[PDB]
Every structure is written in C-alpha cells, then in structure tokens.
Amino acid sequence: EGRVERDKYANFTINFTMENQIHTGMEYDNGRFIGVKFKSVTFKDSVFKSCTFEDVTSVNTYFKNCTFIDTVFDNTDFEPYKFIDSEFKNCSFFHNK
C-alpha cells in the first residue's frame, strides 16, 4: 500500500478488487488504480495527487468531499454521480468512444 506519512500513501499500484471499505482523511500521491473493480467503496475527505485510474469499473462507489489534483481518469466508468461535493484541479478524463 506504501504508507509513507501520517496522512498519506504514495507510489503504490492496486490492480485487484476493492470491496466493502470506507477510507477517510487520507492523501494518495502517485497512486495507480489499474484494472480495479470497486464495489461498495467510499472515499471521504481524501486527496488524490498525480494518481492514475485506468480501466476501472465501480458499483455503489462514491468519492465524497474529495479533491483530485493532476490526476488522470483513463477508461474508467466514473460518471459525475460517482462524486459528491468533490473538486478537480488540472485533471484529465479519457474514454474510448
């Protein structure tokens, strides 16, 4: 997972199912979520810096009051309704037609 500071994870790759979890108040620097299936996962009050979400699907998954900075969403299923009161700063969104 790459826990480096009190408040953050860094330089990690997740490429496995994430299921039935709630994460609050964490920063994630240079996180790579590659081919991940999120299932009933909530991130709350979290910061994502220079992360990559790639080929991810998600069910009952929410980002609540999260900030995304310099983050890339590449072929995710992340529609607007995945986010509640969230903030994007210099973020890129790519998807196949």
Place this chain on the structure above:
Amino acid sequence: PMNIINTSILNLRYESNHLIDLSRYASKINIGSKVNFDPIDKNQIQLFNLESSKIEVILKNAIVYNSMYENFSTSFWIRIPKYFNSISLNNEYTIINCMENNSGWKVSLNYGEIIWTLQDTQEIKQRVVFKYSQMINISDYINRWIFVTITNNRLNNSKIYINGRLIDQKPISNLGNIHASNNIMFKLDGCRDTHRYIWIKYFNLFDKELNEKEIKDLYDNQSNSGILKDFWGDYLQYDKPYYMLNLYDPNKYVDVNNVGIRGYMYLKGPRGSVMTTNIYLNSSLYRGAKFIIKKYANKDNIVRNNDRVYINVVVKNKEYRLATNASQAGVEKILSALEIPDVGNLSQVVVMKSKNDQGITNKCKMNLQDNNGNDIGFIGFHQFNNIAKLVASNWYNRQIERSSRTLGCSWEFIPVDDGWGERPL
C-alpha cells in the same frame, strides 16, 4: 517597417541589447530587475506578479495626452496563461497603466477578459471589453498569442479589435477632457493570483483612430509570415517535442500501433478533456506520440518556411524516425516510425510549409520527399479498413489551398507550456 509604425508616437522594440523606443520622440524606458525577455525572441517580454517586474515609459511632454478631441490608438500582442485559481474570478487587474489623478487610459485583464478603460477629468469613464470562455474544446485565445488593437474616436466610439477583427465597441462621446499620465506603466497591478503572468510583444501608440485596412496590415506584417509557429504562436523550433493536432479532426491524436516498417501511425480518438472545477474545461492537448523536428538542410533554432527537415517520433520515451517506402502500392504512402539506425534508403526528408492563411503562421504542412528530392506528398491521413493511418499523398499537393480538402494535411505542433497546466502523457 510600414509607415504607420514609422510615424507612431511610441514604438517599443528590443534592439542592440536594450528595450528602446524607435519613434521620432525617443521616449525614455526604465526596466525593472525582474522583467524576463525570451532568449529566442527578445521582443517577447514576460511580466510577473512582482513589484520589480515592470516597464516604465516616461513620455516626452509633447506627446502626453490631454485632450477632448484628439483620436488615438494602441496595438500590441499578448499571451495570457490559462486562469487556474478561483481567486482570479472577479479580480480585475491593470497591466498597462496611463492613468493619473483618476484620468487617462489603461489596459486591464480579468478572468477571460481583456479590458480597455477611458476616464475623463470629471470621473466619467467608459469600458470596452473582449470576453473569451475557458469552457471550450479548443480556444483561439487561451494561452495563445493574441493581436490586440484599440482605437478611440473622440466624436463617437472606442473599438477593440482581436486578431484584426472588430469584437467590441462603445460610445465615448459623453467623455470630456482626458488628461492621461506622463508615463506608461507596464505591470501587473491589483492581481491577487501570486503566480499570474503575461507575455507581451510589439507595443505601439498611434495619434489617430486606425482604420480597418491599417489594422489588417499591422496584423499581417507583425505575424512574421516567413517563420513557422507552434500552436501557442511561438517560433517553431528544432529539437523540441511537440504533440500533434490535425485540423481535419481536432478530436483525434497521433498514435503508433507498432514501431518498425511493418507498423504504422494513425489518428485515434476522442482526445478527452482536461478540467478544473468551475474554472476551465478544455480538450486535452498532451496526447499521443510527439514529433521532434530535426535539422537537415541557419545556425539558429527556428524552423522557417521551406526548411528541409527530418521528423523524429517519440514512442514510450524513445526516438524513432518518421519514414515511408514510396514503392508501396497506391498514391497514399503509409508512414512508419523506424529505428533511426535502421532507416536505410527509406523516404524521410520533409519540406516544412505554412498554410497561406491570414494571421500567425502556425497551420503547418509537411511535404515528404525521396532521397532524390522528388515529392512523395503532404502528410495527412487515409482510411484503411476504418483505420485513419498517417500517409504521405500527392493528392494533397494537387488541391487548391483554402479548399477544405487540405485540412487533412494541416497540422499544429503543441509543446508543453507553463500556461496550459495539463499533465503530460
């Protein structure tokens, strides 16, 4: 230079290692210690949000404006970085200040705005405003060189022109005596965004209302049509990585399916988007393989019209050579990205050409040639089994220019720039 510049009341240019006024009046120029000049073109001046980042023109008393009736114009080029910070919403800041005792003129900026303000000695003011959106796929304006011309006819109207076209105007005949400042301060004034800056170039002041033709001539002359430009409007250069934009479908980017002579390059989309919540939403520009222009046939680094070059293509942080075998069947010669020592006798020499359009010379064409200098054709694309493969084709060279058929072979080169703020991939 043309007559209107020769007779300008101020002509601010970099020459022989100094920023000076070339006008007959030879006004004094004071430069602060934190003004940046672009080493490749020192007429391009960068001003930061810092006290010492300023230029002051102390005007000759003769040409100090203090009138009810004298018409005047100003022209300049500006390049304004994208707005990033919400503190920039509703924050008007002066950039070019000729106001004293609440009278005169000024150029100011705001989120998605260029503003011209006149104010008389009775406190009566009038504003003329150019607006551009940051919620737009590809902007002509955001972080790209813009030619601004502002004219003032004291009997009727003040006008703002952008890239030679009239955009806004407002009546000014309700303004009385205008007593402008003894000096002009080029400086960011009142800007709350600590990291804000501007680039400016070729400032001029004229003692008449410029007409449409004079404005068009001024725009065309200062466009530097002999030199190719990048997407942002800067000089196209050798040895600098560029993302590519094809003007027929700006919603695609260049990709390489495999390296080598059995592989091909193609256009793949959609580009997708880059955004900051409530601030901007644009088409992503930093996508796909990059092209590097290489010297073949001037000691400087600038790419000029009719320069013969090589093109390297950057695939996963390694450089390859753009090339084709012109013997392949058909008019359309599919391009490949070759290992550089492996290119052999393949066709790789490119004549850089500008599309002969009005304004900045940044719509570029690339005419592939064989090693005997024979045209293989402009680089565009062609559908093969629903795949838009890059090709060189002499069909392009047989078309009328300004015919929509040449859009396929028209490109823009986009380098990573500080004023854009997208993560490069």
